[PDB]
Amino acid sequence: AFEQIKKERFDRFNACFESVATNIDEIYKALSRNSSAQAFLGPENPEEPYLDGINYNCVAPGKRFRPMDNLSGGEKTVAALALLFAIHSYKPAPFFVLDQIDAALDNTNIGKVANYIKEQSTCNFQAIVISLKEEFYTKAESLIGVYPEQGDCVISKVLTFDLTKYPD
Amino acid sequence: MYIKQVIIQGFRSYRDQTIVDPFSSKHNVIVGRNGSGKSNFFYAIQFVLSDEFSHLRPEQRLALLHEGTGPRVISAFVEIIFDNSDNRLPIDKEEVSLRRVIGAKKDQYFLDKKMVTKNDVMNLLESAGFSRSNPYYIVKQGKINQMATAPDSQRLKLLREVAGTRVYDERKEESISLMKETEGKREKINELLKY
Amino acid sequence: KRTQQMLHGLQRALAKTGAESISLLELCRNTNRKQAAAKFYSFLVLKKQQAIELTQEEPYSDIIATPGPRFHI
Amino acid sequence: GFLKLIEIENFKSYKGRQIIGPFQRFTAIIGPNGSGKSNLMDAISFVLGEKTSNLRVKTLRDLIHGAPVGKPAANRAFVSMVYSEEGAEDRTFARVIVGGSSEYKINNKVVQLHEYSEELEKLGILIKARNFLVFQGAVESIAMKNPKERTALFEEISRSGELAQEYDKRKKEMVK
Amino acid sequence: RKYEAIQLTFKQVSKNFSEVFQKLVPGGKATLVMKKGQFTGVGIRVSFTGKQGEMREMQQLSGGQKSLVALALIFAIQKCDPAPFYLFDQIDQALDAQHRKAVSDMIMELAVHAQFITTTFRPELLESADKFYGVKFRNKVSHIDVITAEMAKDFVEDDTTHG
Amino acid sequence: KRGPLAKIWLAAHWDKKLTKAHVFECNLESSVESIISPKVKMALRTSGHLLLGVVRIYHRKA
Amino acid sequence: GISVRKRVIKILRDICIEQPTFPKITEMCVKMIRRVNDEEGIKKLVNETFQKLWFTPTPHNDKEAMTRKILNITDVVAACRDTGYDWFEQLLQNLLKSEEDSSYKPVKKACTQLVDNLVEHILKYEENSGRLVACITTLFLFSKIRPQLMVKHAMTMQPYLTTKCSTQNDFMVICNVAKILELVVPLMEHPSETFLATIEEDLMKLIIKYGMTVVQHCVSCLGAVVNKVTQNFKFVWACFNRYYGAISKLKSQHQEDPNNTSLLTNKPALLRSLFTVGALCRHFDFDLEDFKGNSKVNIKDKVLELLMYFTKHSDEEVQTKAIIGLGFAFIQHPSLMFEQEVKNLYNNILSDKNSSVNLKIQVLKNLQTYLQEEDTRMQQADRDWKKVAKQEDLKEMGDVSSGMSSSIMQLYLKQVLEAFFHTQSSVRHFALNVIALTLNQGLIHPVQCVPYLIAMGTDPEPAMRNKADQQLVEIDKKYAGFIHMKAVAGMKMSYQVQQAINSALCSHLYSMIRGNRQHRRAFLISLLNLFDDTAKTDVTMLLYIADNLACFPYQTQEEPLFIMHHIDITLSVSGSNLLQSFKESLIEFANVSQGILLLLMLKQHLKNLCGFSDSKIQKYSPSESAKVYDKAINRKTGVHFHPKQTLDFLRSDMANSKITEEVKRSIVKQYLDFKLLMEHL
Ligand SMILES: Nc1ncnc2c1ncn2[C@@H]1O[C@H](COP(=O)(O)OP(=O)(O)NP(=O)(O)O)[C@@H](O)[C@H]1O
C-alpha cells in the first residue's frame, strides 16, 4: 500500500516536473534572443522528489556562473518571466495579469520582452498589463486610460482608445 | 562630510580602480546600461562605513571576492578619502584616508597607516554622526516601500535613533545589572563587618 | 517644461475655431502610433490638471473636451 | 475562449455601475500615478478568488467604496466578468459580499463556492496555486523564495496535495 | 535631559514634515501623532484631494503615495539636521512626471547643504546637476569614469534599439 | 590623552590598562560627579560613556 | 595547520643557510616555491627568505661564490622543469610587484646583475649542454615575468638562432630563444633593420629544416615581429601562396585519382603543407585588404573546405595533421566553429566507437589550447585598458566577443564527458585536464557534470584523482548543497567505470558529506535499502558497495548504530519471509539468497570491527539524543578482512549461473548456512 501511494505521487510529480524543466530551458534560450544562456531547474533527493527543495540556477547572458542572490534584479526579472511563461506552457492558462514588471529593466530589455510578448500573444493566451513606459504598450493595439476625479473621495473612471489605424 | 573620492581594488567587479576626477558638492548623478555594476559601487561605499553588510557567513564572504580571470586574488582592499574641513570628524587633516583590507581571515581598517582595534572606529563614526547598524540613509533598489508599511514601532525606533539616544539607553541598562551585583556585594560586606 | 509649452499649444489649437469641441479622431487622423499614444496620455494628464473636462459615451468614439476652472486664461 | 470584459460596483474607489469596455486580443491599462488602477486587478483577483490577506486590506469591510476614509455607501458590492468561449454562448460569473460571508453566482443563480470552483478547475485555473498573478513588487520575490515554497506551488498545481494524509498515515502505520 | 530632548525633537520633526509634504504634493496635508502613552509608537495621518473628509490608515495606498511619504520624511529629517551624504538607488520607478519634476526642484533647492549621488533610467532627475559619471563593463570587469551631459541626455531616451 | 578627566575616558573606552593603583586614590568621586552636570558643550553620548566609566570605577573600588 | 608550516619552513631556512652542498637542496627549493601561494603569513616569510637567500646585491668581489649561487638557481630550475613553472612565476610576480614604490629599489639592481652575469657566463661558456639549455630556459622565464631586464643582449643572442644541431636540447634552445625574441622585440629601443632582415631570413631557414613544434613556436615570433614593426607582409603572403597552391594541386590531382603514386613520394611536402597552412592562418591574419591586394575570395572558407575534403582518406597521420590545422584555423575566428560540417564531424569522430586513438587526444588538445589562448588574450588585453577604452560605446555591451567561449563548449561537453569512459589512459588524462580547466572559468553550469567528475576518483593513477578530488573540494566549498544532490548516481557511474576498466576509493566523498546530519542519514538509507531489499542489482555492484561501506572511516558513533539498526530490521523481515517460503516449498532463490547472505556477513563483519554487544546496539534507538553517543570508535589494527571474506563468499557463489547438478547441492548448503546464521548468536 505504501508502494502504491508513493508510485502515485512520484508519477504525477515527475511527469509534470520534467516537462517543465525541458520547456524552461528552451524558453529562456529563446527569450534572451542570444544563444549563451542556460537555466536548470533541478530537484533534490531524486528518489522521493515530492518532499525536498527544487532548486533553480540560471546563467546571465554574458558572465560567469554565480549564485542566484548575487545576480542583479534586471536579470532576475527576466528569469522570473521565463519561469512564469514555462509554467503556463506546461498546462495552458487563458490569460496573464502583468503589473509593472518594468521596475528595473532597461528600455532595450523591455523592447525585446515586448517583441516576445507580441509574437506569443496571438494564438496562445490573452495578456493584460499595467505599466508606465510607453515602449511596452506600443506593440499593443488598444489602450485603456484610467483617470481619477477630485471629490469627497477620489472617484475614478475609465475610457478606451483604438490604435489599429496608424503606421508602424 | 564631503566624499572627495574612492579607490577600489578587487572587490566585486572593480579589479583595479586608480584615481578618478573628484566629486562635486551638489549633485552627481550616475547612469549606466542594465547590468553594468553601479549598485555594487554603493555596496562598496556602505561595506566600508556600515558594519551590517559584512555580517554574512564565510561562504558568502568568499563569494564576495571578485574572481574573473588569471590568478585569484585573496586580499581585496578599498580606500576612501574625504575632507573634514568643518572638523566634524575630530582628528585634524585636510584629506582623511581610511581603508578596509578584506581577506578570508583578515579584516583591517588602516587610518593613516596606523593600526586600530575595530571598536574605536565604530565609536568614532557614531560620535561623528554616522550610524553603523542603521539601514536608514542608504536605500537599496526596491526597499523604499517598506518604510511605509512598516509597523509604527520601527519608525519610533528610527526617529529615536535620529535623536541620538541609543548609546545612553544601552549603557544605562548594562550598568544597572553590575550595580545591582555591587548591592549584593555590599550586603556581603556588612555581614563580614558585623562578624 | 515641455508639458506646459504643449499646454499653450493646446490653447492655440483651441483658439482657432472656438466651437469648444476638440475631437480625438480628428486630432489623431494623420500621426504615427507612438506620438498618438503620447498625446492621448497628455489628454489624461490634462484631465488631471482640472483645466479640461472630457466626455465619452460609447466604448469606442472620440472624446469631447471643454475648458474648466484652471485654464490660466 | 478569452477575457471579454468585466463589471464593477462600489468596489474600491469605483462608485456606481460602469462597464469596462470589450477587450481586444492584447490590451493595456495605462494612467498617471495615484489614479487607482491596481484595484481593477484586485477585482479580477476577487472574482476568480484570492484569500483576503492578499487583497492588501484588512478585515474585508473596508472593501466598500469610501469605507477606509470613514463613510460607507451601501451594504453591497458586485464584481462580475463575462467569459466568452467557442460555441456562441456566454457565461456570467458573479460574487456578492454580505456581512462577513461571500456568495457566488453562476448564470445569475446563487451557488456555493465548491461547484463554482470545480467549474473554474474545468476551465484551467488553480486559485489556491497563485501562479499567474504578479503584484507591484513580487516579480523579484519570485526568484528569491526559499525553495520549499516553490515546491509547495509545484505540488499544488499537480493535484498531489490531496494525497498527503493517505501518505503519512500509511507511513506511521508501516513504521509502527 | 533625555526626555526633554525627545519632546523637542519630536516637535521639530513633526513641523518640518508638515512643511515638506505640503510643498511636494500640490494639495493636501499630513501630520505625525503619538500613541497612547510611556510611548509605544508613532502614527501618521495623511489626507489629500478632499482636505477634510480624508483621514487615512496605511494599508490602502499606492506605490507613488507611499514612496512620496518616505522621501518626504527623508527630506524632512534632513532639513532638521543634515546628514553626510545621500545616495539613491531606483527611487524614481514609482512616481510620475509631475511628481518627478517636483522632486527634482526640491533637490535643486535643497542641494546646497549635502552631497547627492543617485541612479535612474529617466532624464528628468538630471535637470539639476553639476557633473556626471559613467560606468563601462567590458571583458568581465567593470570600469567607471566621467562623461558629458550631451551624450547622457541623448542616451537616456532618444534610442530604442539593441544599441 | 590630555585633561583632568582622561582616566574616566580610559575607563569608558579601553578600561583594561586601569590598574589598582590608578583606581585606588587618583580620583575623588564626589567632585568629578559634580563636575559632570554643569560642563559646557557636553555631548549626551559622552555623558553616557562617562557614566559607564565612573560606575565601573565604583564597582572596582567596591 | 598554520603553526607547523612556519616551523618546518624555519628549519628548512636554517638548513639551506648553514651547511650547503647537502644533496637535497634543490628539492627543498622546489617544495618551498610550491607553497608560495597557499596563505598570507607563509607568503610574507617565504618572500623575505627568498629576498635574503638569493636576490641580494652580491657586491662585485668573490665572483666564484656568486657563480656557485648561480649554479644553485640553475640546478633548482632545471630539476623542477618537469612539473611546471606556475609557482616560480607567481613568486616572481610577488617579488617584483611587491616593491612598486621607490624604496631604495634593492631587488632591481640585483636581478639585473644576475641576468647580465648569466649573459657573461654564457659568453665565456663558448662550448654540460643540459646546463646551457637550462640557463637559456631561465633567461626565458625571466623574460616572461618582466621584459625590461633582457633588453640589451638580444642582438648578441642572435648568432645562436642562426644555426644549431639536430638534438633535442638544441631544439629547446631554438624554441626558447624564439620565445624570448617574441617577448622582447617590440620594446627594443630603436633596432637596426638589417638585424630584422637576417632574423626573418634565418627564421624561414629554420622553418624549412626542423620539426613541428619548433616551426609553430617560431612562426609565432614571425607573426609578432611582422605585426609590431616591419611591414613586408608580401613575404608571408608569397609563402602562403605557394603552400595554398601546392595543396590545391594535390587536392585536384587526388580528386579523380585515388590510386596514384605521387602521395608515396611527396608525403613530406603534404604533411609540412598542412602544418604550415594551419600555423600561418593561426598566428597572422592575411585575409584583409592588402594581403590579397584585391577583393576577398574568402580564403578561410577555401582552406576549411580543402581540409574537410582531405579528412576522408586512407591514412591516419594526414587526418591528424588536418584536424590540427582546423584547430589552428579556429583559434583566430571562433564563429567558424558554428558551421554544420565541423560540428557534425567532431560529434561523429568522438562518438560511435571509432577505431582511431589519436583523434580523441588531438580533439582534447584543440579544446585545451583554445581555452588557454582565449583566457590569456583576454587577460593581457585587460592589462592595457586606458589607451583604447575611450573609443567604444556605452550603449552596445558587446557579447559576440565574450559569450562565445561558453556556447562552443555546449556542443561537445556531454560527448567529452562520455569520452571519460575510455580504456586508454592518455585520453582520460587529457579529457580530465580539459574539463577541470574549463570549469574554473564558470563557462558552463556545474551541476550537470558533477557525478561523473566525482566518480572519476576511482582510477589507479594518483595524479588524476588527486587533481579531480582537489577540484571537487573547490566546487563544494562555495555551494553547500551541490554534491549532496547527486550521490547514488555517482557510485553507480563509478561502478560502471570500474566494470569498463577491468582500498577506500570512495572515502574522500564520504568524509566530505559527513558534515550534515540529515544528508548523512539520507543518502545512506536510500542507497542501502533500495539496492538490497527488492532490486535485482548486480552482484558485482553489491560487492563494490559492500567493500566501500566496510572501508569507510568512521569518526562518530551515530553511523554504525544507525546502519546496524536498519539492516537488522530489514534483514529480520525479508530473511524470515525467505526462509519460510523456501521451507514451505529455484535459481531465483539462489540469487536473492546470495544477496541477503552477503548483507548478513556485512553486518557480522561490522559487529566484529566494533566488538560491541547486540544488547548495546538494540538499546540505541533513532533520534534518542544528539550528544549521548559521542565516543570515537576505537579500531583494532589490521582487521580489514572484508575483502577476504567477500572473496570466500564469491567463491561460494562461484560466478556460475544455472549450469550443473552440483550447484543445486551448493544451493542446499547455502540454505543450511542460512539456518546456521539464524543459529548464530
Ligand atoms: N563579484 C562579482 N564578480 C563579477 N561579477 C559580479 C560580481 N558581483 C556581481 N557581479 C555582476 O555584476 C552585474 C552588475 O550587478 P549590479 O551592480 O547588482 O547591477 P545593477 O546596477 O544593480 N543592475 P540594475 O539595477 O538593473 O541597473 C551583475 O550581472 C552581477 O552578476
Ligand SMILES: Nc1ncnc2c1ncn2[C@@H]1O[C@H](COP(=O)(O)OP(=O)(O)NP(=O)(O)O)[C@@H](O)[C@H]1O
Ligand atoms: N474603497 C475605496 N474607496 C475609495 N478610495 C479608496 C478605496 N480603497 C482605496 N482607496 C484609495 O484610492 C486609491 C486607490 O489605491 P490603489 O488602487 O492602490 O491605486 P494604484 O492603482 O496602485 N495607483 P497608481 O499605481 O499610482 O496608478 C488610494 O489613494 C487609496 O487610498
